Amino acid sequence: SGFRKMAFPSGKVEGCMVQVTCGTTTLNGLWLDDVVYCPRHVICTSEDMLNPNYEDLLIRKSNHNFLVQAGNVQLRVIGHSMQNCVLKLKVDTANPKTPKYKFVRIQPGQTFSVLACYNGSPSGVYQCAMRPNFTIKGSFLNGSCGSVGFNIDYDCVSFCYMHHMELPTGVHAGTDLEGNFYGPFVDRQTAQAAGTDTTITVNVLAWLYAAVINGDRWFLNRFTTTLNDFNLVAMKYNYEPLTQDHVDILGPLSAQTGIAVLDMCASLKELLQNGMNGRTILGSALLEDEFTPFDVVRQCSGVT
């Protein structure tokens, strides 16, 4: 028992982390096969970060300008291209440590592990979620650009996020591995509206199933609700509306505890309207929405 904000093991992703320097700017790159993926803002100095013309800035650069270092060894760049907001630097060597990998675009509300990196060297791994408004609440500093978010299905690493920007609001913005920004963000030094964020209702419900599994049952009540009534409450408390698909996804956790999904919604409804009353659920004094139903089943079952 016990419930931790567990991240996937980062070894497979550490073997791919390289440093990419371009001019005075240094950041992280991801080396898989004979290619190094990194944010395109590596070609920018501080002045032109206000409104950069990346097509124009990339034209004054040639393969010899992209200094890629895999730890201490220099990688020979034999090709370069811009795909959306990432630069693809083809290197003459394929990463001997390339794991089985996929590039996937996750849905808002999905979770992943992030391996923070500075100068192509890792510092830590933390589990986090893609907010409903496509931002991430990461822990990132200058030079963490190029740090990736990922998932691991047994041996395959599904790379879902490359880190790019820190919004003036302290939250982070990034892209999928094809250079597509999650959310409305652009790679410019301009204040950007992240939009209204909500609470991922299905994940909160999943975390309530993980509490019952792990002994915390105080919030369980003798009530039930409908999806209609629940959503009236969920809108007021700025929670994502619960759909029938969410209920079906919660099927396995509902079968493990024997607590119907609308019965769990009644517990959530009461907690939303009354608060925790100074009590904690899984050592937390707030409703946690960063554990999807798959994470709860995986952690409470033991998927390696």
Ligand X SMILES: COc1ccc(Cl)cc1CC(=O)Nc1cncc2ccccc12
**C-alpha to C-alpha distance for 56 and 71, rounded to whole angstroms:** 30
**C-alpha to C-alpha distance for 40 and 298, rounded to whole angstroms:** 36
User: Judged by CB under 6 A, does residue 182 bind ligand X?
Assistant: no
- Please select the residue that binds ligand X; options are 48, 166, 229, 270, rule is CB under 6 A: 166
**C-alpha to C-alpha distance for 193 and 261, rounded to whole angstroms:** 35
In the window 100-139, what residues touch its own copies (CB under 8 A)?
Answer: 115-119, 121-128, 137-139
Q: Give min distance, CB of 168 to its own copies, in A.
A: 10
Q: Could you please report the per-residue DSSP string of 166-181?
A: E-TTS-EEEE-TTSPB
Nearer residue to ligand X within complex by CB, 22 or 165: 165
Q: Tokens 């959310």 appear where? A: 183
- Contacts of residue 107, defined as CB under 8 A and 6 or more positions apart, other chains included, come to 130
Give, in order, the Cα–Cα distances in Å from 161 to each of 107, 110, 279.
11, 11, 35
147 binds, among ligand X, its own copies, none (CB under 5 to 8 A by kind): none
Nearer residue to its own copies within complex by CB, 35 or 300: 300
- Please select the residue that binds its own copies; options are 94, 141, 186, 235, rule is CB under 8 A: 141
**C-alpha to C-alpha distance for 80 and 193, rounded to whole angstroms:** 32
Out of 22, 117, 145, 265, the active site residue is 145
In the window 219-278, what residues touch its own copies (CB under 8 A)?
Answer: 275-276, 278
CA angle 33–157–75, rounded 5-degree value: 25
122 binds, among ligand X, its own copies, none (CB under 5 to 8 A by kind): its own copies
286 binds, among its own copies, ligand X, none (CB under 5 to 8 A by kind): its own copies
Establish whether 145 is a catalytic residue: yes
Tell me the one-letter amino acid at 293: P
Residues near its own copies (CB under 8 A) are 1-12, 14-15, 115-119, 121-128, 137-144, 166, 170-172, 214-215, 275-276, 278, 280, 283-286, 298-304
